[PDB]
Amino acid sequence: NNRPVYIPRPRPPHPRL
Amino acid sequence: NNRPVYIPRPRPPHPRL
Amino acid sequence: MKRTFQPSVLKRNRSHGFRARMATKNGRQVLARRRAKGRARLTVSK
Amino acid sequence: MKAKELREKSVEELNTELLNLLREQFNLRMQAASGQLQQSHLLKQVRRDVARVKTLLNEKAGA
Amino acid sequence: MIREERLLKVLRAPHVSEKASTAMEKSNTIVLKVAKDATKAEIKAAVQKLFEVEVEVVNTLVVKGKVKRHGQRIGRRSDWKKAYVTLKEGQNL
RNA sequence: UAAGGUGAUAUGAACCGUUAUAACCGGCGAUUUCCGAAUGGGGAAACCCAGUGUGUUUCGACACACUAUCAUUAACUGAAUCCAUAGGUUAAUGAGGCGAACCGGGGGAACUGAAACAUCUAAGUACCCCGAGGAAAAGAAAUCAACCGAGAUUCCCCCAGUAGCGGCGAGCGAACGGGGAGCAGCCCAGAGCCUGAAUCAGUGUGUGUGUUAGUGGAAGCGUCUGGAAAGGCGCGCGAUACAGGGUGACAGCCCCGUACACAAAAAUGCACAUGCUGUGAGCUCGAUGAGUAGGGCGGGACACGUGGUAUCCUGUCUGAAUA
RNA sequence: AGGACCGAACCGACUAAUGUCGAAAAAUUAGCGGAUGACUUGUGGCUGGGGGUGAAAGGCCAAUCAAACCGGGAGAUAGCU
RNA sequence: CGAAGGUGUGCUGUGAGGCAUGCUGGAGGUAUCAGAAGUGCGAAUGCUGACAUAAGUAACGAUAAAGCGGGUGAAAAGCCCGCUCGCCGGAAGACCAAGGGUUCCUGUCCAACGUUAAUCGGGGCAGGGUGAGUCGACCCCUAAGGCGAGGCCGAAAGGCGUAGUCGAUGGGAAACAGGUUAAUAUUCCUGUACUUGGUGUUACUGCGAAGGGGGGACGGAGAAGGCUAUGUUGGCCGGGCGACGGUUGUCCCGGUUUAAGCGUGUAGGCUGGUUUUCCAGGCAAAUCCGGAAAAUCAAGGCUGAGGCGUGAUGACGAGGCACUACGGUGCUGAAGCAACAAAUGCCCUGCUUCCAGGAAAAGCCUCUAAGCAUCAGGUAACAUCAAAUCGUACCCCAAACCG
């Protein structure tokens, strides 16, 4: 299984998540 | 930051003739 | 207001498609120029 | 193991190639998809083995 | 002959979802992923041999990949094919 | 080569290997989906649909291979008419497409300059088309010179903005000759005598060297400041290695390298030696390129625009001599 | 029967107002013309720039047409600013 | 124990400048004398980026319209639920093609996007979702037109075109009803059907083409007749009699639905049938077509909506009942008829008229040539097998297409 996708560091105006 | 591409034709001037 | 561009997949392919370009030499030259410039989309296609 | 089957005849080497695909290749893929395959290196090992056996078949058969 | 290992390669994985579960419990059908081409005849033959079961019919469909937005780059998921394999009254898995 | 590895964004998971069949690098092989000259037919490229010939668990249905066109050659067939030819089928060989410039040939502008503009210039330039190679083209005098002589072609520097051409306007602009780079001359239009007789081309073996992985490769410590010294201060060492890069500030002596000395199982380039195959010396005698040279008319190339205009080329109409 | 009549869809665009950094790079609102025909419309073809097409306005040919667009000659030329 | 750069101050030269130093900065800088320049900017309606101005001004995109309660939430005029009001209703509703290409559904998030807020969304993130022998494409055939073996023509490129091969906007085999998912169904499920091929068996038989014929196969307008979709009313079944007067009555509300296929084949429309003989036409042939002859009967044949049966004592069905993660789920289920009106839809590629005279080819039917006739092949019946591949979500007069 591959849950981890390694989300990258986003932009200063990025989705708050 | 594209400079305006379409400039409309100038309004016809008043006839000074 | 009917604008100039009225999309149609069939007409688009038959006018600027790969097979249309290769049929005549000038279109072949067009493909050659695109390849030299290294354009990702050589022509129009799905 | 690379030269272990290099001295095998076509029939027997063809058989182990059959077994490699039937078992440890199809079954592993199902386990990985279902999520019960804790260790994934088997898929790499079996795939390379299938390639190694397959090249010997071509090298031996014909040319 | 290479029909054998072809049948060993058309199946890719089983599909798990609430629709898949509902179909299995109600219509006795199992939905599973198959190869890109995976013609119905090949899928039927593969299910017969590997699962030693009997299938009424197989009907397939192609699922187009989604366009996903990773970081500052755009990308498209690979297309794949799923088959609704229908079993008879007697089933094993 | 090797104690580290499983490419990167990019951590992890699960594993491999550590004295050699982990990984990595090089040579030679295998694999090489579909589109694309695309070549089985078609097609809206990455798709659809076939024939034939070989082999196979339920007739079911599959696997492999082949099947484009054109050119040349051969065979088998074969019309209008006997023969024949065209034509048709088969087999073999080659071609096809792409590619930055350079090269040769076939076409060929205008802006612009002349302070306008038409001859002219721009310019045989841009551009289009065809063909070929690693260079191509050109080329062994029906040439120059001057009655002294030079001995194929190409390129560079002079001669020289000279002589000339030119609405003698704008502009274009040589040759002879001199100094250099580099050097090479041969064959067919034909018979005899003598016959591998040299020089070449296509392929083996051996030698030398190069290329595709690589290996070894010298020599510095102590103190001060500082987050950390390669810096300051003191005393040393190597150098056929102070070319470079990295290392917590600027390193000959910390690391990778450099100078230097070595290495190739395998595959290849070049230079030689030695074999095979094919074409071919030398001597005697003879021949010595005809719709050509030249000419009339119309154009082009020659620096040279028809001018007193030689020379070359060509569309058209004519037409010699031959030592 | 009708290039017949009134009139919706549909096609057209005569008048006025609004709108001119507008909702819209010619529209909306209220009226208006044709509406079985020289009608209108979908799909696909053909005509390529000193040309096409034109019940003819130098109109139209991808919001550009008394000679389209793109690239090149080209850093054209400018006794002018 | 602090380079360039940056930011101040103090001095100095006639000027362009120079020098010193504080703070920041953090590792480069460079005297002197020479050499070389992309060697100095304030303007060119200069070019690029950044930031002002107007200015917290105009505007917030149809004058179809909102109000209240409850819920979730940090926060509710905008979200969800409920009760009212309003708007469209030949559309602002419901289905497709074209074109988009996940905008579909569920969970979660509110920075950016939405001309405001936002818990919401066609926004971000993750998962799920497109099921076909019958629908469409593909496929067989062809129109305009394209390409085009040879060929003809042209400085080259290339142009035109025959045989051919492509090209739907046309022709060609087959499915309907009901139910089900948060999201697909004429695809899944249930019920009941249909079509085209392959193989085998049985009983008969002459088969056989890029060849012939038939069919396919066609205009405008107009009219009438017969029907249906559909609607209204009555009957029937179920429920109600009622907060402001009256309402057991001719009262009020709801329901009264069912296909393809198969059978019968009707109104209507078209054509006179059958048998025999002969014929240089159908580029060969022909039992077919066409033509010419007689004999005999006046009738058959073709086409054909709807209706009625079957499909179906099945499905659907108001309502009621039992539990609700309180969205819904499960169970049960009466009547299901008649009359009238009526299409722009069907009979009708019909009929009657008019001049402007209204595609092609294949599938299909039929006759033969070559060739094969103890075969093969064909016909009928039965059995069995096959029907692949691609599209299938969602928008589709619009917030998803072109602007």
Swiss-Prot record, chain C:
Pfam families: Ribosomal_L34
Presence of keyword Ribosomal protein: yes
Keywords: Ribonucleoprotein, Ribosomal protein
Gene3D superfamilies: 1.10.287.3980
Cellular component annotations (GO), alphabetically ordered: cytoplasm; cytosolic large ribosomal subunit
InterPro entries: Ribosomal_bL34, Ribosomal_bL34_CS
Entry keyword annotation includes Ribosomal protein: yes
One biological process term in Gene Ontology: cytoplasmic translation
Single GO molecular function: structural constituent of ribosome
PROSITE patterns: RIBOSOMAL_L34
Subunit structure: Part of the 50S ribosomal subunit.
Family: Belongs to the bacterial ribosomal protein bL34 family.
Name of the protein in its database record: Large ribosomal subunit protein bL34
Species whose genome carries this gene: Escherichia coli (strain K12)
UniProtKB/Swiss-Prot annotation, chain D:
Entry's Gene Ontology BP terms: cytoplasmic translation; ribosomal large subunit assembly
Single GO molecular function: rRNA binding
A Pfam family matched in the record: Ribosomal_L29
Entry GO terms, CC: cytoplasm; cytosolic large ribosomal subunit
Keywords: Ribonucleoprotein, Ribosomal protein, RNA-binding, rRNA-binding
Keyword Cytoplasm tagged: no
PROSITE patterns: RIBOSOMAL_L29
Observed phenotype of the null mutant: Cells missing both S17 and L29 grow very slowly and have a rather unstable temperature-sensitive phenotype.
Family: Belongs to the universal ribosomal protein uL29 family.
Role of this protein: Binds 23S rRNA. It is not essential for growth. One of the proteins that surrounds the polypeptide exit tunnel on the outside of the subunit. Contacts trigger factor.
NCBIfam families the UniProt entry points to: L29
Assembly and binders: Part of the 50s ribosomal subunit. Contacts protein L23, trigger factor and protein nascent chains. Might also contact SecE and probably does contact SecG when the SecYEG translocation complex is docked with the ribosome.
Name this protein carries in UniProt: Large ribosomal subunit protein uL29
Swiss-Prot record, chain E:
UniProt-listed GO biological process terms: cytoplasmic translation; ribosomal large subunit assembly
Signal peptide positions (record): none
Phenotype when changing residue 18 to A: Binds normally to ribosomes; strongly reduces trigger factor binding
Superkingdom classification of source: Bacteria
Single GO molecular function: structural constituent of ribosome
Outcome when changing residue 18 to Q: Strongly reduces trigger factor binding
Keywords of the record: Ribonucleoprotein, Ribosomal protein, RNA-binding, rRNA-binding
Pfam families: Ribosomal_L23 (PF00276)
GO cellular component: cytoplasm; cytosolic large ribosomal subunit
Subunit-level organization: Part of the 50S ribosomal subunit. Contacts protein L29 and trigger factor. Might also contact SecE and probably does contact SecG and SecY when the SecYEG translocation complex is docked with the ribosome.
Function: One of the early assembly proteins, it binds 23S rRNA; is essential for growth. One of the proteins that surround the polypeptide exit tunnel on the outside of the subunit. Acts as the docking site for trigger factor for Ffh binding to the ribosome (SRP54) and to nascent polypeptide chains.
UniProt record similarity statement: Belongs to the universal ribosomal protein uL23 family.
Protein name per UniProt: Large ribosomal subunit protein uL23
Natural source organism: Escherichia coli (strain K12)
Gene field: rplW
